[PDB]
DNA sequence: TTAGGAAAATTTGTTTCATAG
DNA sequence: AACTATGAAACAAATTTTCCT
Protein backbone atom coordinates (compact mmCIF):
# COMPACT_ATOMS: atom_id res chain seq x y z
CA UNK A 1 0.00 0.00 0.00
CA UNK A 2 2.71 2.61 -0.76
CA UNK A 3 0.84 5.97 -0.59
CA UNK A 4 1.11 8.87 -3.05
CA UNK A 5 3.60 11.66 -2.74
CA UNK A 6 3.78 15.02 -4.47
CA UNK A 7 7.03 13.93 -6.09
CA UNK A 8 5.22 11.04 -7.70
CA UNK A 9 2.09 12.73 -8.90
CA UNK A 10 4.19 15.40 -10.45
CA UNK A 11 6.19 12.71 -12.32
CA UNK A 12 3.01 11.15 -13.52
CA UNK A 13 1.60 14.45 -14.79
CA UNK A 14 4.81 15.58 -16.49
CA UNK A 15 5.00 12.20 -18.16
CA UNK A 16 1.50 12.58 -19.69
CA UNK A 17 2.72 15.46 -21.73
CA UNK A 18 2.96 14.82 -25.46
CA UNK A 19 6.70 15.70 -25.05
CA UNK A 20 7.51 14.70 -21.49
CA UNK A 21 7.47 18.39 -20.42
CA UNK A 22 4.90 20.73 -18.84
CA UNK A 23 4.53 24.25 -17.41
CA UNK A 24 3.97 24.65 -13.70
CA UNK A 25 0.60 25.96 -14.65
CA UNK A 26 -0.29 22.94 -16.78
CA UNK A 27 0.72 20.92 -13.84
CA UNK A 28 -1.77 22.81 -11.68
CA UNK A 29 -4.35 22.04 -14.35
CA UNK A 30 -3.53 18.43 -14.06
CA UNK A 31 -3.82 18.46 -10.35
CA UNK A 32 -7.00 20.47 -10.74
CA UNK A 33 -8.51 18.07 -13.20
CA UNK A 34 -7.77 15.37 -10.59
CA UNK A 35 -8.93 17.26 -7.40
CA UNK A 36 -11.99 17.64 -9.57
CA UNK A 37 -12.80 13.96 -9.35
CA UNK A 38 -12.24 12.88 -5.89
CA UNK A 39 -15.23 14.06 -3.95
CA UNK A 40 -17.34 13.80 -7.13
CA UNK A 41 -16.74 10.10 -6.97
CA UNK A 42 -19.84 8.08 -6.23
CA UNK A 43 -20.39 5.50 -3.50
CA UNK A 44 -20.33 2.84 -6.17
CA UNK A 45 -17.17 3.51 -8.13
CA UNK A 46 -16.16 -0.14 -8.08
CA UNK A 47 -19.27 -0.56 -10.22
CA UNK A 48 -17.95 2.11 -12.60
CA UNK A 49 -14.54 0.51 -12.96
CA UNK A 50 -15.93 -2.99 -13.54
CA UNK A 51 -18.15 -1.31 -16.12
CA UNK A 52 -15.59 0.65 -18.11
CA UNK A 53 -13.30 -2.37 -18.01
CA UNK A 54 -15.75 -4.63 -19.74
CA UNK A 55 -17.22 -1.93 -22.00
CA UNK A 56 -14.28 -0.38 -23.74
CA UNK A 57 -12.19 -2.32 -26.12
CA UNK A 58 -9.06 -0.59 -24.80
CA UNK A 59 -9.12 -2.98 -21.86
CA UNK A 60 -8.38 -6.58 -22.46
CA UNK A 61 -8.43 -9.31 -19.87
CA UNK A 62 -5.61 -11.80 -20.03
CA UNK A 63 -5.22 -14.80 -17.71
CA UNK A 64 -1.51 -15.09 -17.10
CA UNK A 65 0.47 -15.19 -13.84
CA UNK A 66 -1.03 -15.23 -10.38
CA UNK A 67 -4.58 -14.93 -11.60
CA UNK A 68 -6.65 -13.19 -14.23
CA UNK A 69 -5.61 -9.61 -14.98
CA UNK A 70 -6.42 -6.55 -17.08
CA UNK A 71 -4.21 -4.94 -19.69
CA UNK A 72 -4.39 -1.92 -21.95
CA UNK A 73 -4.32 -1.74 -25.73
CA UNK A 74 -2.44 1.48 -26.46
CA UNK A 75 -3.78 1.36 -30.01
CA UNK A 76 -7.44 1.15 -29.15
CA UNK A 77 -6.93 3.91 -26.69
CA UNK A 78 -5.23 6.21 -29.18
CA UNK A 79 -8.46 6.42 -31.29
CA UNK A 80 -10.86 7.48 -28.42
CA UNK B 1 -12.49 22.22 -15.87
CA UNK B 2 -13.49 18.56 -16.65
CA UNK B 3 -12.70 15.47 -14.59
CA UNK B 4 -10.54 12.89 -16.27
CA UNK B 5 -12.67 9.93 -17.23
CA UNK B 6 -12.77 6.56 -15.64
CA UNK B 7 -11.23 5.18 -18.80
CA UNK B 8 -8.22 7.55 -18.54
CA UNK B 9 -7.56 6.97 -14.88
CA UNK B 10 -8.07 3.21 -15.23
CA UNK B 11 -5.59 3.16 -18.10
CA UNK B 12 -3.14 4.96 -15.79
CA UNK B 13 -3.59 2.62 -12.91
CA UNK B 14 -2.90 -0.27 -15.25
CA UNK B 15 0.35 1.46 -16.30
CA UNK B 16 1.72 2.44 -12.89
CA UNK B 17 2.58 -1.18 -12.29
CA UNK B 18 5.67 -1.47 -14.47
CA UNK B 19 4.40 -4.72 -16.03
CA UNK B 20 1.63 -2.68 -17.71
CA UNK B 21 -1.09 -4.95 -16.25
CA UNK B 22 -2.92 -5.31 -12.94
CA UNK B 23 -5.91 -7.14 -11.47
CA UNK B 24 -9.16 -5.51 -10.54
CA UNK B 25 -8.44 -5.32 -6.84
CA UNK B 26 -4.97 -4.04 -7.56
CA UNK B 27 -6.75 -1.18 -9.34
CA UNK B 28 -9.22 -0.48 -6.54
CA UNK B 29 -6.17 0.28 -4.41
CA UNK B 30 -4.49 2.69 -6.84
CA UNK B 31 -7.76 4.51 -6.92
CA UNK B 32 -7.80 4.58 -3.13
CA UNK B 33 -4.26 5.85 -2.82
CA UNK B 34 -5.49 8.69 -4.94
CA UNK B 35 -8.87 9.16 -3.12
CA UNK B 36 -6.79 9.37 0.03
CA UNK B 37 -4.17 11.79 -1.11
CA UNK B 38 -6.76 14.29 -2.24
CA UNK B 39 -8.84 14.04 0.88
CA UNK B 40 -5.60 14.78 2.79
CA UNK B 41 -3.88 17.61 0.96
CA UNK B 42 -6.56 19.64 -0.77
CA UNK B 43 -4.72 22.60 0.83
CA UNK B 44 -2.65 25.26 -1.00
CA UNK B 45 -1.76 22.56 -3.60
CA UNK B 46 -0.16 24.92 -6.17
CA UNK B 47 2.41 26.09 -3.66
CA UNK B 48 3.62 22.51 -2.88
CA UNK B 49 4.05 21.95 -6.57
CA UNK B 50 6.68 24.71 -7.07
CA UNK B 51 8.26 23.71 -3.80
CA UNK B 52 8.75 20.19 -5.09
CA UNK B 53 9.78 20.79 -8.73
CA UNK B 54 12.56 22.94 -7.31
CA UNK B 55 13.52 20.71 -4.33
CA UNK B 56 13.52 17.16 -5.74
CA UNK B 57 16.38 17.23 -8.20
CA UNK B 58 14.79 14.61 -10.36
CA UNK B 59 12.88 17.60 -11.68
CA UNK B 60 14.71 19.77 -14.09
CA UNK B 61 14.00 23.01 -15.90
CA UNK B 62 14.69 23.23 -19.59
CA UNK B 63 14.26 25.77 -22.37
CA UNK B 64 11.71 25.47 -25.23
CA UNK B 65 11.06 28.12 -27.92
CA UNK B 66 7.73 27.49 -26.45
CA UNK B 67 8.99 28.67 -23.06
CA UNK B 68 10.47 27.67 -19.71
CA UNK B 69 9.35 24.15 -18.78
CA UNK B 70 9.84 21.28 -16.32
CA UNK B 71 10.82 17.73 -17.13
CA UNK B 72 11.63 14.69 -15.10
CA UNK B 73 15.02 13.06 -15.17
CA UNK B 74 13.90 9.47 -14.99
CA UNK B 75 17.52 8.41 -14.54
CA UNK B 76 17.54 10.50 -11.33
CA UNK B 77 14.47 9.10 -9.66
CA UNK B 78 14.58 5.37 -8.74
CA UNK B 79 17.70 5.90 -6.55
CA UNK B 80 21.45 6.76 -6.38
C1' DT C 1 -13.52 -33.72 -4.96
C1' DT C 2 -18.49 -30.44 -4.42
C1' DA C 3 -21.14 -26.55 -2.74
C1' DG C 4 -22.49 -22.29 -2.01
C1' DG C 5 -21.58 -17.52 -1.84
C1' DA C 6 -19.13 -13.63 -3.08
C1' DA C 7 -16.14 -11.05 -6.28
C1' DA C 8 -15.54 -10.33 -11.13
C1' DA C 9 -17.32 -9.76 -15.72
C1' DT C 10 -20.69 -8.73 -18.66
C1' DT C 11 -25.05 -6.61 -20.42
C1' DT C 12 -28.94 -3.53 -20.58
C1' DG C 13 -31.07 0.54 -19.65
C1' DT C 14 -31.45 6.00 -18.21
C1' DT C 15 -29.99 10.52 -18.59
C1' DT C 16 -27.14 14.25 -19.32
C1' DC C 17 -24.14 17.63 -21.86
C1' DA C 18 -21.60 18.91 -25.97
C1' DT C 19 -21.03 19.13 -31.07
C1' DA C 20 -22.27 20.11 -36.23
C1' DG C 21 -26.48 20.87 -39.21
C1' DA D 1 -34.62 30.27 -31.06
C1' DA D 2 -36.27 24.48 -32.22
C1' DC D 3 -35.26 20.84 -34.26
C1' DT D 4 -32.47 17.03 -35.85
C1' DA D 5 -29.00 13.85 -35.33
C1' DT D 6 -24.84 11.97 -33.07
C1' DG D 7 -21.88 10.25 -29.47
C1' DA D 8 -19.22 10.47 -24.89
C1' DA D 9 -19.74 9.79 -20.17
C1' DA D 10 -21.62 8.67 -15.81
C1' DC D 11 -24.87 5.89 -13.16
C1' DA D 12 -27.98 2.13 -12.05
C1' DA D 13 -28.85 -2.17 -12.34
C1' DA D 14 -29.63 -6.83 -13.85
C1' DT D 15 -27.64 -11.31 -15.21
C1' DT D 16 -24.16 -14.56 -15.91
C1' DT D 17 -19.33 -16.56 -14.89
C1' DT D 18 -15.15 -17.19 -12.02
C1' DC D 19 -13.05 -17.71 -8.13
C1' DC D 20 -12.54 -18.73 -3.07
C1' DT D 21 -13.70 -21.40 0.86
Swiss-Prot record, chains A, B:
Changing residue 34 to T: Disrupts dimerization but does not affect DNA-binding. Changing residue 12 to Q: No loss of DNA-binding. Disrupts dimerization but does not affect DNA-binding. Induction: Down-regulated in regulatory T-cells (Treg) during inflammation. Up-regulated by FOXO3. Residues 1-80 bind DNA. Polyubiquitinated, leading to its proteasomal degradation in regulatory T-cells (Treg) which is mediated by STUB1 in a HSPA1A/B-dependent manner. Deubiquitinated by USP7 and USP44; leading to increase in protein stability. Phosphorylation by CDK2 negatively regulates its transcriptional activity and protein stability. It is found in: Nucleus; Cytoplasm. There is a cross-link at residue 57 (Glycyl lysine isopeptide (Lys-Gly) (interchain with G-Cter in ubiquitin)). Changing residue 38 to C: In IPEX; no loss of protein expression. A motif (Nuclear localization signal) lies at residues 78-80. Changing residue 3 to A: In IPEX; no loss of protein expression. It comes from the Eukaryota. Transcriptional regulator which is crucial for the development and inhibitory function of regulatory T-cells (Treg). Plays an essential role in maintaining homeostasis of the immune system by allowing the acquisition of full suppressive function and stability of the Treg lineage, and by directly modulating the expansion and function of conventional T-cells. Can act either as a transcriptional repressor or a transcriptional activator depending on its interactions with other transcription factors, histone acetylases and deacetylases. The fork-head DNA-binding domain is essential for its dimerization and interaction with NFATC2. Homodimer. Dimerization is essential for its transcriptional regulator activity. Interacts with IKZF3. Isoform 1 (via LXXLL motif), but not isoform 2, interacts with isoform 4 of RORA (via AF-2 motif). Interacts with STUB1, HSPA8 and HSPA1A/B. Interacts with PPP1CA, PPP1CB and PPP1CG. Interacts with KAT5 and HDAC7. Interacts with HDAC9 in the absence of T-cell stimulation. Interacts with USP7. Interacts with isoform 2 of ZFP90 and can form a complex with TRIM28 in the presence of isoform 2 of ZFP90. Interacts with RUNX1. Interacts with RORC. Interacts with RELA and NFATC2. It is linked to Immunodeficiency polyendocrinopathy, enteropathy, X-linked syndrome: Characterized by neonatal onset insulin-dependent diabetes mellitus, infections, secretory diarrhea, thrombocytopenia, anemia and eczema. It is usually lethal in infancy. This is Forkhead box protein P3. It comes from Homo sapiens (Human). The gene is FOXP3.
Amino acid sequence: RPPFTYATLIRWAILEAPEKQRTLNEIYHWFTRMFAFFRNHPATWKNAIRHNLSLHKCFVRVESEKGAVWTVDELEFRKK
